[PDB]
Amino acid sequence: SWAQSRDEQNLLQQKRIWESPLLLAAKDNDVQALNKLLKYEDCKVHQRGAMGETALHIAALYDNLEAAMVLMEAAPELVFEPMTSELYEGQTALHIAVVNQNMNLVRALLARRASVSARATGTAFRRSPRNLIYFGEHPLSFAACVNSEEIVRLLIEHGADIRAQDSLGNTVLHILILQPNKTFACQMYNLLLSYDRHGDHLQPLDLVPNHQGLTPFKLAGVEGNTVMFQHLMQKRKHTQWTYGPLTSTLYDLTEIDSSGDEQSLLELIITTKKREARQILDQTPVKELVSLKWKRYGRPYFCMLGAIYLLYIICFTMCCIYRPLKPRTNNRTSPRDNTLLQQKLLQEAYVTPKDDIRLVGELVTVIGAIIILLVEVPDGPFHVLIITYAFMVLVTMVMRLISASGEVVPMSFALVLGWCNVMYFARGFQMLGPFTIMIQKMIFGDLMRFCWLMAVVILGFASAFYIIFQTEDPEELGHFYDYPMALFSTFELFLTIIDGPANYNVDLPFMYSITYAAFAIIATLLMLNLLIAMMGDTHWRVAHERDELWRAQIVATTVMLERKLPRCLWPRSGICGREYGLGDRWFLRVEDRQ
Amino acid sequence: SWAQSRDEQNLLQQKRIWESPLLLAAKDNDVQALNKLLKYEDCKVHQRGAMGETALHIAALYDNLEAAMVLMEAAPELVFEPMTSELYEGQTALHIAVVNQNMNLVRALLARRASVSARATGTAFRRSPRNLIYFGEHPLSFAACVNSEEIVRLLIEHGADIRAQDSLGNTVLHILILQPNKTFACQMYNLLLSYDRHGDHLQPLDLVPNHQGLTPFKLAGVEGNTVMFQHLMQKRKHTQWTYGPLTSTLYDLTEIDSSGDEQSLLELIITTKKREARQILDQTPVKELVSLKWKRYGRPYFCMLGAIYLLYIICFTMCCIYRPLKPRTNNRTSPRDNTLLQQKLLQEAYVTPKDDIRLVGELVTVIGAIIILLVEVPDGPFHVLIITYAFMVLVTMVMRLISASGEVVPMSFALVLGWCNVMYFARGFQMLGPFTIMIQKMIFGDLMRFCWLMAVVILGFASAFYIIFQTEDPEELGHFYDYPMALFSTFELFLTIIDGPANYNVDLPFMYSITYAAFAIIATLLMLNLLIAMMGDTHWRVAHERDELWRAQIVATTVMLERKLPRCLWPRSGICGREYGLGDRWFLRVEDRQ
Ligand SMILES: CCCCCCCC/C=C/CCCCCCCC(=O)O[C@@H](COC(=O)CCCCCCCCCCCCCCC)COP(=O)([O-])OCC[N+](C)(C)C
Ligand SMILES: CCCCCCCC/C=C/CCCCCCCC(=O)O[C@@H](COC(=O)CCCCCCCCCCCCCCC)COP(=O)([O-])OCC[N+](C)(C)C
Ligand SMILES: CCCCCCCC/C=C\CCCCCCCC(=O)O[C@@H](COC(=O)CCCCCCCCCCCCCCC)COP(=O)([O-])OCC[N+](C)(C)C
Ligand SMILES: CCCCCCCC/C=C\CCCCCCCC(=O)O[C@@H](COC(=O)CCCCCCCCCCCCCCC)COP(=O)([O-])OCC[N+](C)(C)C
Ligand SMILES: CCCCCCCC/C=C\CCCCCCCC(=O)O[C@@H](COC(=O)CCCCCCCCCCCCCCC)COP(=O)([O-])OCC[N+](C)(C)C
Ligand SMILES: CCCCCCCC/C=C\CCCCCCCC(=O)O[C@@H](COC(=O)CCCCCCCCCCCCCCC)COP(=O)([O-])OCC[N+](C)(C)C
Ligand SMILES: CCCCCCCC/C=C\CCCCCCCC(=O)O[C@@H](COC(=O)CCCCCCCCCCCCCCC)COP(=O)([O-])OCC[N+](C)(C)C
Ligand SMILES: CCCCCCCC/C=C\CCCCCCCC(=O)O[C@@H](COC(=O)CCCCCCCCCCCCCCC)COP(=O)([O-])OCC[N+](C)(C)C
Ligand SMILES: CCCCCCCC/C=C\CCCCCCCC(=O)O[C@@H](COC(=O)CCCCCCCCCCCCCCC)COP(=O)([O-])OCC[N+](C)(C)C
Ligand SMILES: CCCCCCCC/C=C\CCCCCCCC(=O)O[C@@H](COC(=O)CCCCCCCCCCCCCCC)COP(=O)([O-])OCC[N+](C)(C)C
Ligand SMILES: CC(C)CCC[C@@H](C)[C@H]1CC[C@H]2[C@@H]3CC=C4C[C@@H](OC(=O)CCC(=O)O)CC[C@]4(C)[C@H]3CC[C@]12C
Ligand SMILES: CC(C)CCC[C@@H](C)[C@H]1CC[C@H]2[C@@H]3CC=C4C[C@@H](OC(=O)CCC(=O)O)CC[C@]4(C)[C@H]3CC[C@]12C
Ligand SMILES: CC(C)CCC[C@@H](C)[C@H]1CC[C@H]2[C@@H]3CC=C4C[C@@H](OC(=O)CCC(=O)O)CC[C@]4(C)[C@H]3CC[C@]12C
Ligand SMILES: [Ca+2]
């Protein structure tokens, strides 16, 4: 929709050029006709195009130097004209000569005092998936992103503010981080810091945030720019001594580690969707900072919560084992009625000393399910499972108070969710950590992507198996006696967890042997070993990147564990530079051998 | 703890430099202030730093030649001063100029007669995981390890004993083996043997042991230094003739093979924790020595003990098959009482001729279990299993004497441990050898690393399955009738070795179909095929390094088999050089084609 609208405008531009003799003589290098056209009376010099363009934009756009000069002595006021469309709003001819790097034509427009502070506020210039370039809004931003060091030196001299911000708030240093050629942005970043030699009317230029509060150093980490991260990090390290093949380097940790309640660089890499951003975790101030947080104050407090959680689930288990049950009051309805016990009423539930021991163990599992809904809910997948466990304990709390039949259904969800959250505390162990990443990527990327092909095969054969045995007696082969049991039996024959139905004392239907032989080939052989082969490649991919997926679990745990525990038992990392003559900062010393 | 203490001392050094005008003028190249400071009265020349350092240490540490010379004519007695801390104790300025390779400043301190036998006995110089360098203690050791051939020639002339030993006992040749740049240590090893041209007041320098009794040749094998092993081996080989493309080389085998009761090089590579040390087993005197020990005297005596052990386990088996049993004296307690035989008392056990044949077969399995506890216990995993077997035979010996019920529990351990020690004698066969390395690395590296995630899933669903069927009659579906049977049934449904519970003649509970369908997906599909895919990569890794893992089993067997058999049936390997005019040594001839 948006692309089809944009394509009809770029074809409409080439029509309006082709119709106008003025614009066609500018597109071509036709200085002959531009003489003869401009000597006519009134000439339609200020005629508009499809993009809002003028004649002097066209000569700048097609790199026609000789046609662009003749239009400037004819009409000198075309230099001050922006494009007036919606898709190129504000773009002047000084932007177009800067992008095309027409070095001779930039000096011409600066001699005609073209404004170097004109903002290209269109929609082909926004940072968006619709646009292939994001060059900013000012001519200094366009020249820096095309790697034109001569034009950047040229129009800073003519007075381009280097501290200018576009709509997103990005300065010229934020935009250089977002460019795809990362090597040339490192040479260009240094050239723009050789300037800013002014009065420094705020904090210096590499410390100015955009509208999301990111300085250029944090934006190089959030976006995943590892080349511009290491280049910007060398302003922060500080070599103490060099003793042969040894170097004691002292890193800064001011924007990397959490100062107060602001979001630090470790909190922003975890809370972003770029897979490239998790390459910053392997960098030389950040790799040593996570190991200090984890080995000292993270792994003690994570194996302490993990052992308080085991004693909570064993206490919840034994008060589901010893739940109150009484013999059945009624008589059996049908011969298919197997239930012979029944749960007690609330009055008769607690009338013995062993019921008072259970009442203590039941108050603990209620209090612990309220504390989960005060730590977690007023704020990944184990967020949802610890909340869902906490509801199921309070759903079966209500059913004990108002005496309601069917407490086994909230308890059975609470047993298998309460026990399978012990898998959360497996990221404290390096050899057990990414096992839960394999269980995640097999469920939400292999099973939830191939169950749609199994539910087709199960519904096809369970309906065939049901009507084959629909005339038969279920007291011999009762696998398919009604339709929900034929679906459950066919799901079990698929996974080969119950044996195939056979009697050998009666004559089975003729279509049974043919249908079950076709079933056991497409279901048990072929489509069950597709899934085992799909999950075998998911295992291989995760176990290959095994140690970098564990370190992203350690960062996310330490960030979680610090913002919820009180500050008095979480010391700040590093050495404080007050009483060593280094400032107010917090340094991390790294000694290395080369 | 130790690292946080070390970091606060290296920041305290940079503060005390920055405070003192004397030390700050030495850190910088400030010969101006050092003139004006030293001309003041008393100057605090002997002022101490945070590391125990003086002013002349600082100028040596920051490579300031012009500042270090002015401090020597001012105070000439600063040359004889060690650092006085705990982390740099004994280090002089002559060590610091040697490490930094300040060639002009070393000749200055030797002109000021700095002692070349001063020991850097700190804690930043010990061989330790805390330190990134191990350079020794003397200036000759520091210069040799930084590959400075000019300083080593310089201070041997000024009288550095080349035969000096640090606290670990290492000479200058032991320290060169421990260095990470192995190629430059080979050039440096030869230069220090061009010296030792003295009276040779003990055995020569490449034969001097440290405090663990290792010469440099054995230390290059224990540490895994294969480059310095082949370089030191060429002093031992001896070419006899060269007949075209043929070479009869004669190797020495004095330190490689076991002379007496001392530990040889093959006994030290097996008994070390370096994985690098097992690369020495593929070297040209050592690869041919293991094949001679195994093909001649190892494989006969290992297939002879392996056939005496089969006749021992068949004899132990048939006296467990024919154990004394009598009909049950009591009557059945409950309908769940299935036992209808009972073991005899000791009086009535041996009263027939077939009991006298068994008594012979039972005395053999008692004697053979005592001999195991006289060969093995007065001294890897099959150490423990042959000892555990030997206890279980003597536990069930006691229970036969004092008549005690329950001999089936010591026997059942003794049957499966006695038979699975036949897998020990599978390293005598090259195609069966590393199969037991795959069984080891799957148990103690895959199962004991993923059973913690299965015991979470089994405890979650066995508790759910138990309370679903807790109101139901167990005479139809009795898989989960009490809680230890619900755990054993859920472990069996996990591994898919019993069929899923179904009746089809009664109505099962509603939560059963939902819980078992969720169980059969996460347990039988997903987490059972994780483990099969994890063990599939353990197979692939071991079968790749298949032949070098078999040769480390052959070395460890031959070492074991030689120190336990008497010497009269184990001939020494090689040809003795007495009656061929070669010494007292034992040579191994290798003929090769190039
Ligand atoms: C770190 C990892 C730990 C490792 C494992 C360590 C522990 C693992 C194992 C642990 C125990 C093993 C159980 C054995 C069964 C006998 C017990 C018993 O006497 O039960 C009695 C009732 O008991 C109840 O009713 C239980 C209900 C409440 C339990 C908790 C109360 C205190 C909670 C406050 C603090 C909670 C924690 C605080 C939370 C932070 C009666 O039972 P019985 O009739 O005698 O049973 C025989 C049945 N049979 C005859 C058929 C055979
Ligand atoms: C290298 C690999 C070898 C390959 C395989 C070769 C061997 C493999 C096979 C071997 C034999 C197979 C057995 C067949 C059964 C008949 C035997 C018999 O007569 O038993 C009798 C009792 O016998 C006993 O009580 C046995 C107890 C002691 C056995 C050892 C005694 C001498 C040990 C000293 C030296 C030990 C060695 C020294 C140690 C260094 C009675 O038995 P039965 O009542 O007639 O049984 C019929 C039962 N049925 C009727 C229900 C069916
Ligand atoms: C699917 C679920 C699977 C996992 C289930 C987990 C659930 C239970 C969770 C955790 C249960 C308890 C921990 C288990 C292991 C014991 C200690 C240990 O070695 O762990 C860690 C050290 O931990 C330490 O720091 C030891 C020093 C004591 C500090 C406090 C420890 C708390 C122990 C109880 C005091 C509590 C006080 C309240 C009283 C109850 C070692 O971790 P690592 O170095 O990173 O290992 C990586 C290397 N590896 C993998 C190769 C080995
Ligand atoms: C009421 C009782 C239960 C209540 C709580 C339980 C509710 C569920 C718990 C947690 C769910 C909430 C977290 C979202 C999923 C996490 C994964 C994710 O981050 O993104 C995922 C999108 O996610 C989805 O696909 C949406 C989920 C659809 C089904 C949800 C309900 C079905 C229950 C499910 C029953 C499990 C079936 C087994 C047994 C029946 C994308 O996948 P990925 O992981 O990011 O990458 C893998 C892709 N790769 C392979 C290409 C690399
Ligand atoms: C991925 C998830 C899918 C899982 C698959 C299964 C999910 C199903 C989940 C639950 C279904 C069971 C609910 C329990 C209540 C019982 C009512 C009932 O259904 O059966 C009733 C019958 O009526 C029917 O036959 C209804 C089924 C019609 C065909 C199924 C199409 C729906 C699937 C389309 C989805 C397509 C999307 C998938 C492909 C893209 C009762 O059966 P009866 O007792 O035998 O009565 C017969 C009367 N007679 C005796 C006269 C003969
Ligand atoms: C097969 C697996 C693949 C499936 C593919 C689909 C192809 C489908 C092909 C054919 C299906 C067409 C069925 C024909 C109708 C017959 C009518 C009838 O009732 O039977 C009669 C006998 O009839 C016979 O016994 C015929 C014997 C051959 C049947 C087809 C064998 C398929 C060979 C495949 C070779 C390999 C090909 C594949 C290679 C990979 C009556 O017998 P009855 O004893 O009285 O039983 C009635 C009992 N009842 C009354 C209770 C109901
Ligand atoms: C899980 C356990 C599995 C294994 C079961 C082990 C338990 C039984 C163990 C061993 C039982 C007996 C040996 C079995 C094989 C026979 C000989 C042989 O070929 O082996 C070896 C030669 O062995 C020789 O040296 C033969 C020359 C006679 C010397 C003494 C042999 C002892 C035989 C009885 C006299 C004793 C007197 C006491 C009275 C009984 C060949 O070894 P290889 O060349 O290195 O193999 C590599 C090639 N391959 C793998 C491709 C083949
Ligand atoms: C009472 C009856 C039995 C009595 C004796 C039996 C006791 C046990 C016998 C021998 C044990 C003594 C040797 C230790 C294990 C050898 C492995 C080793 O050297 O290093 C291991 C550390 O070792 C461990 O992990 C410690 C073992 C913990 C559990 C021990 C008892 C459990 C029984 C066990 C029950 C087995 C369960 C199956 C069926 C039940 C490291 O593993 P690795 O091999 O060096 O390399 C593989 C890792 N890789 C893959 C990353 C490369
Ligand atoms: C990897 C190794 C772990 C293996 C997993 C399995 C290990 C288990 C091994 C052995 C257990 C069985 C021992 C035999 C003696 C019987 C006593 C008994 O347990 O049941 C008794 C009940 O009491 C209970 O319910 C206790 C169980 C509570 C929860 C389990 C916590 C232990 C696991 C925590 C460790 C977490 C570490 C793992 C995760 C990090 C008797 O049962 P009953 O007859 O039905 O009585 C009910 C009375 N009623 C009739 C009134 C209702
Ligand atoms: C399912 C597998 C995954 C599990 C995930 C967890 C999700 C859990 C979702 C739901 C669980 C919540 C249960 C609701 C409570 C009902 C109360 C009741 O007792 O039943 C009533 C009927 O009620 C019905 O039959 C409802 C119809 C089916 C609903 C659930 C189908 C799940 C569809 C999933 C589609 C694919 C989704 C997944 C795709 C991969 C009474 O019936 P009854 O005959 O009288 O029986 C009582 C007999 N008793 C008295 C002996 C006890
Ligand atoms: C009455 C008393 C004795 C009961 C004790 C209660 C504890 C067993 C509970 C109370 C608070 C719980 C914690 C509350 C919140 C969290 C955060 C939660 O983190 C996540 O969900 C992050 C997972 C992810 O995003 O991947 C993990 C469980 C944990 C530590 C809980 C572990 C179990 C705790 C310690
Ligand atoms: C009464 C008589 C006829 C019985 C004969 C007894 C033999 C069957 C026993 C006695 C001594 C036993 C040996 C004693 C000790 C050892 C060393 C033991 O070596 C290890 O445990 C090393 C394994 C490892 O470290 O990996 C292997 C079994 C073996 C050869 C035993 C094999 C079986 C032997 C020969
Ligand atoms: C009656 C029941 C309860 C007894 C339980 C039996 C297990 C405790 C035993 C039987 C089989 C044994 C295994 C048989 C073979 C091996 C391979 C073995 O591998 C090696 O040592 C190879 C080393 C090398 O050659 O370099 C290590 C012991 C292990 C895992 C054993 C460990 C203990 C096991 C599992
Ligand atoms: Ca079966």
From Swiss-Prot, chains A, B:
Expressed at high levels in the gastrointestinal tract, including esophagus, stomach, duodenum, jejunum, ileum and colon, and in pancreas, placenta, prostate and salivary gland. Expressed at moderate levels in liver, kidney and testis. Expressed in trophoblasts of placenta villus trees (at protein level). Expressed in locally advanced prostate cancer, metastatic and androgen-insensitive prostatic lesions but not detected in healthy prostate tissue and benign prostatic hyperplasia. It is found in: Cell membrane. Keywords: ANK repeat, Calcium, Calcium channel, Calcium transport, Calmodulin-binding, Cell membrane, Disease variant, Glycoprotein, Ion channel, Ion transport, Membrane, Metal-binding, Phosphoprotein, Repeat, Transmembrane, Transmembrane helix, Transport. ANK repeats lie at residues 17-47, 51-80, 89-118, 135-164, 168-210, 212-241. Its main location: membrane. Residues 555-559 are annotated as: Interaction with S100A10. Glycans are attached at N331. Residues 66-76 are annotated as: Interaction with calmodulin. One of its GO terms (cellular component) is calcium channel complex. One of its GO terms (molecular function) is calmodulin binding. It is a multi-pass membrane protein. Ca(2+) binds at D499. Glycosylated. Phosphorylation at Tyr-134 by SRC leads to an increased calcium influx through the channel. Probably dephosphorylated at this site by PTPN1. Phosphorylation by PRKCA at the calmodulin binding site delays channel inactivation. Residues 483-502 dip into the membrane without crossing it. Residues 322-358, 401-406, 470-482, 503-513 are extracellular. The chain crosses the membrane at residues 301-321, 359-379, 381-400, 407-426, 447-469, 514-534. GO terms for biological process: calcium ion homeostasis; calcium ion import across plasma membrane; calcium ion transmembrane transport; calcium ion transport; parathyroid hormone secretion; regulation of calcium ion-dependent exocytosis; response to calcium ion. It catalyses: Ca(2+)(in) = Ca(2+)(out). A motif (Selectivity filter) lies at residues 498-502. The modification Phosphotyrosine is found at Y134. Belongs to the transient receptor (TC 1.A.4) family. TrpV subfamily. TRPV6 sub-subfamily. It is linked to Hyperparathyroidism, transient neonatal: An autosomal recessive disease characterized by impaired transplacental maternal-fetal transport of calcium, high serum PTH levels and signs of metabolic bone disease in the neonatal period. Skeletal anomalies include generalized osteopenia, narrow chest, short ribs with multiple healing fractures, and bowing or fractures of long bones. Affected individuals experience postnatal respiratory and feeding difficulties. The condition improves within a short time after birth once calcium is provided orally. Calcium selective cation channel that mediates Ca(2+) uptake in various tissues, including the intestine. Important for normal Ca(2+) ion homeostasis in the body, including bone and skin. The channel is activated by low internal calcium level, probably including intracellular calcium store depletion, and the current exhibits an inward rectification. Inactivation includes both a rapid Ca(2+)-dependent and a slower Ca(2+)-calmodulin-dependent mechanism; the latter may be regulated by phosphorylation. In vitro, is slowly inhibited by Mg(2+) in a voltage-independent manner. Homotetramer. Probably also forms heterotetramers with TRPV5. Interacts with TRPV5. Interacts with S100A10 and probably with the ANAX2-S100A10 heterotetramer. The interaction with S100A10 is required for the trafficking to the plasma membrane. Interacts with BSPRY. Interacts with TCAF1 and TCAF2 isoform 2. Interacts with calmodulin. This is Transient receptor potential cation channel subfamily V member 6. It comes from Homo sapiens (Human). The lineage of its organism: Eukaryota, Metazoa, Chordata, Craniata, Vertebrata.
